């Protein structure tokens, strides 16, 4: 008998929360099902944890917010069903989930563009393609900036669909061959220098980015910017185990030449101490003597002179040998020349007088009273003089880089832009540290500004459609743990952070002490944890996450030598100078300042969402894991969504449709009732549903979750039997 049989998604590991199997549902009391698992135990599960498994009709659903088992297992199922069709991509709420197929597949010709122009969301398939259109629509009708959000780790295939936003904007916008090359360049320019491997991803992005693709105010493009946020310089002298330091530095070294090698005075990799102590100088199946090619004609692409691709190169150089230059405290306070081979070489790639750099890193003089004196510093202090030198550099080098493609881009008669924003991910580690929390902050305010949208949204629904029902900002649920990160009164981490920082005397212990003593069983969402006396936990949208607090006082402070500002001022380099004379504030409220901007900015305009996950950690094409899809849905938000949507009345009914297909339940309504709201609630009141479950809308039913699964499997039964149940 088909039609009796109730199935369920279930663990069989609780642990391993993300890998599910199908059960069978067997018995049912007023709280709880009992199930059979696929070998055949029993188990109990309470009705409101269970996971029941939508009815096949809802398969394939482009929407995830018409399930009505709104439950994780069931969204990975319909993203499967969709998947092995080959439909990539699928709407989660706002969100656009677009899944790598890891193959290639011809979605994106002309005659694919030409189906969504001018279509809303609702007339056409999911493709980045509708997204586009909606957004360019809405900013001409509304004469407002857009953005769209796109998450990916590098292989989920976030470059690409960026690359296809920006091509059917200039196939819908364009008169612009030429910027659309020199926009799309630029990222193999700015990703050798703000991506590295870590331990979860062989390419991440350590900074953030907001590429503005500009249009007149008759709507044609007329050029772009790219602005940068939040680059991890940290990285520049320290990577943890196994992870690396960002790109160029591998690629230089791989793909010079023996000319360049020689001039710049270049050996291996592991010849240098920036690049030799993580025991990783390679990735497997990356090639960064290739990469370095793609970077240089990137560089030729967007208009960067020979002579400053040399200069950009010996910077990096520059750095590196900087990094190799061994302090020794010649025996007293004071540190040494140790041996002059690395400061040279640093000098002549730098274009600086050797003997000026060397006195200013070890004998910097800063105003004693209100006159010179040279501080003569220990070994230890001038390694982190010459460590913040080096970050110093690759930062303003960084900032650089992006003014020069913001040169040879276009910005005359801007009107609006479509800006894409590209940050960097949610990431937990085996050890997260103060880098990991700044991200993670991040994200924490980027899923609230999602929730905040999808509630004005929300709000704006019921109110057309009349439905009898409120609900609170959902923004809210993430302001306990901002507040707990960047919070005035109650001071916050970061408040508490930039507190110690002041003192000199203040310790990891100290601080982390501090930050017990103010949140420990006080605040729900930090926890002190009972074996360790370094980590605290901090419960975000995505999860705890642990954080070790070591070196933070250190981190939170980025003071540079004048001394060392004044020797680079000097230099023989074009491009070295500008990065001195083109034109106090700890770390923690830098990064502040700077979200804060974003947002800023971010909040003037209608935000698009999309996120983009692989299927597989195998670049395998046909495979899907469950565990690897939902994780990333997690990190991304699309998991925090459903949370939200499964909560109301997700599901919403045209009456007439209800009516053509649920008339058969009630005896005396015809298919075709000319009085659509009245054959649904006949329908409805002679099934017996609870009218807590539904709401009338103007020109929708409402349903909580489950409810219109219940009906379809009313009508599942009703069709294979004899006569109306009893
Ligand atoms: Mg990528
Ligand atoms: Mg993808």
């Not at 993300?18 to 698992?37: A, L, P, Q, R, W």
């Not at 904007?169 to 630029?186: H, K, T, Y």
């Not at 062989?202 to 709507?219: M, P």
């Given at each position: 008998?088909?039609?009796?049989?109730?199935?369920?998604?279930?663990?069989?590991?609780?642990?391993?929360?993300?890998?599910?199997?199908?059960?069978?549902?067997?018995?049912?009391?007023?709280?709880?099902?009992?199930?059979?698992?696929?070998?055949?135990?029993?188990?109990?599960?309470?009705?409101?944890?269970?996971?029941?498994?939508?009815?096949?009709?809802?398969?394939?659903?482009?929407?995830?917010?018409?399930?009505?088992?709104?439950?994780?297992?069931?969204?990975?199922?319909?993203?499967?069903?969709?998947?092995?069709?080959?439909?990539?991509?699928?709407?989660?709420?706002?969100?656009?989930?677009?899944?790598?197929?890891?193959?290639?597949?011809?979605?994106?010709?002309?005659?694919?563009?030409?189906?969504?122009?001018?279509?809303?969301?609702?007339?056409?398939?999911?493709?980045?393609?509708?997204?586009?259109?909606?957004?360019?629509?809405?900013?001409?009708?509304?004469?407002?900036?857009?953005?769209?959000?796109?998450?990916?780790?590098?292989?989920?295939?976030?470059?690409?669909?960026?690359?296809?936003?920006?091509?059917?904007?200039?196939?819908?916008?364009?008169?612009?061959?030429?910027?659309?090359?020199?926009?799309?360049?630029?990222?193999?320019?700015?990703?050798?220098?703000?991506?590295?491997?870590?331990?979860?991803?062989?390419?991440?992005?350590?900074?953030?980015?907001?590429?503005?693709?500009?249009?007149?105010?008759?709507?044609?493009?007329?050029?772009?910017?790219?602005?940068?946020?939040?680059?991890?310089?940290?990285?520049?002298?320290?990577?943890?185990?196994?992870?690396?330091?960002?790109?160029?530095?591998?690629?230089?070294?791989?793909?010079?030449?023996?000319?360049?090698?020689?001039?710049?005075?270049?050996?291996?990799?592991?010849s240098f101490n920036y690049l030799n102590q993580s025991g990783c100088v390679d990735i497997k199946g990356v090639s960064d003597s290739e990469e370095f090619k793609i970077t240089r004609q990137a560089m030729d692409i967007v208009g960067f002179s020979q002579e400053e691709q040399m200069s950009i190169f010996k910077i990096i150089a520059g750095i590196l040998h900087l990094g190799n230059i061994k302090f020794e405290k010649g025996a007293g306070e004071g540190a040494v020349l140790k041996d002059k081979t690395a400061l040279n070489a640093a000098s002549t790639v730098f274009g600086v007088n050797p003997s000026v750099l060397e006195k200013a890193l070890m004998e910097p003089r800063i105003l004693a009273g209100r006159d010179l004196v040279a501080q003569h510093l220990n070994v230890e202090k001038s390694s982190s003089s010459r460590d913040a030198l080096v970050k110093a550099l690759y930062g303003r080098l960084f900032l650089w880089l992006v003014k020069k493609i913001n040169n040879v881009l276009c910005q005359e008669r801007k009107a609006y832009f479509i800006g894409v924003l590209d940050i960097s991910g949610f990431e937990i580690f085996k050890v997260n540290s103060f880098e990991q929390l700044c991200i993670n902050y991040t994200n924490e305010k980027l899923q609230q500004f999602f929730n905040h949208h999808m509630f004005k949204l929300e709000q704006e629904e019921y109110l057309k459609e009349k439905i009898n029902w409120t609900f609170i900002d959902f923004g809210l649920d993430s302001q306990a743990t901002i507040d707990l990160i960047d919070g005035r009164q109650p001071p916050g981490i970061l408040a508490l952070l930039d507190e110690q920082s002041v003192f000199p005397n203040a310790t990891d212990n100290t601080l982390i002490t501090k930050l017990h003593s103010h949140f420990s069983k006080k605040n729900a969402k930090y926890e002190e944890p009972r074996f360790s006396k370094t980590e605290f936990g901090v419960t975000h949208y995505a999860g705890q996450v642990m954080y070790e607090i070591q070196d933070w006082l250190e981190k939170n402070k980025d003071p540079l030598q004048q001394d060392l500002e004044l020797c680079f001022k000097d230099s023989s380099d074009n491009v070295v100078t500008k990065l001195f004379n083109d034109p106090f504030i700890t770390v923690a409220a830098q990064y502040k300042e700077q979200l804060a901007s974003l947002m800023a900015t971010l909040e003037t305009t209608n935000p698009h969402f999309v996120r983009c996950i692989i299927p597989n950690n195998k670049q395998l094409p046909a495979k899907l894991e469950d565990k690897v899809v939902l994780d990333q849905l997690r990190c991304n938000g699309v998991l925090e969504g459903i949370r939200i949507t499964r909560k109301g009345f997700p599901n919403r009914i045209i009456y007439a449709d209800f009516v053509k297909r649920y008339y058969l339940l009630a005896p005396n309504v015809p298919r075709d009732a000319e009085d659509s709201q009245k054959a649904t609630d006949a329908v409805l009141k002679h099934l017996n549903i609870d009218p807590e479950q539904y709401r009338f809308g103007i020109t929708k039913i409402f349903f909580r979750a489950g409810q219109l699964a219940r009906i379809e499997e009313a009508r599942e039964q009703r069709l294979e039997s004899n006569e109306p149940p009893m």
């Open positions: 008998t088909v039609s009796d049989k109730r199935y369920i998604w279930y663990n069989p590991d609780p642990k391993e929360r993300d890998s599910y199997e199908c059960g069978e549902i067997v018995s049912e009391t007023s709280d709880s099902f009992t199930f059979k698992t696929v070998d055949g135990q029993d188990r109990q599960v309470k009705k409101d944890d269970a996971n029941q498994r939508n009815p096949i009709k809802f398969d394939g659903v482009e929407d995830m917010s018409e399930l009505s088992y709104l439950n994780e297992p069931a969204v990975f199922h319909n993203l499967r069903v969709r998947y092995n069709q080959d439909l990539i991509y699928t709407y989660s709420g706002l969100f656009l989930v677009a899944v790598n197929p890891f193959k290639r597949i011809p979605i994106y010709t002309q005659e694919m563009v030409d189906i969504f122009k001018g279509r809303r969301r609702n007339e056409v398939a999911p493709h980045i393609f509708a997204i586009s259109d909606v957004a360019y629509r809405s900013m001409l009708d509304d004469r407002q900036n857009q953005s769209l959000l796109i998450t990916g780790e590098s292989g989920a295939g976030k470059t690409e669909n960026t690359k296809k936003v920006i091509q059917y904007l200039a196939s819908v916008a364009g008169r612009s061959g030429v910027l659309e090359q020199q926009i799309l360049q630029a990222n193999p320019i700015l990703e050798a220098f703000g991506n590295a491997k870590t331990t979860r991803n062989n390419n991440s992005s350590r900074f953030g980015k907001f590429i503005e693709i500009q249009f007149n105010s008759a709507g044609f493009i007329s050029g772009a910017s790219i602005q940068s946020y939040l680059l991890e310089k940290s990285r520049v002298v320290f990577q943890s185990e196994t992870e690396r330091n960002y790109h160029i530095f591998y690629q230089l070294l791989a793909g010079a030449t023996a000319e360049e090698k020689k001039a710049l005075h270049l050996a291996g990799p592991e």
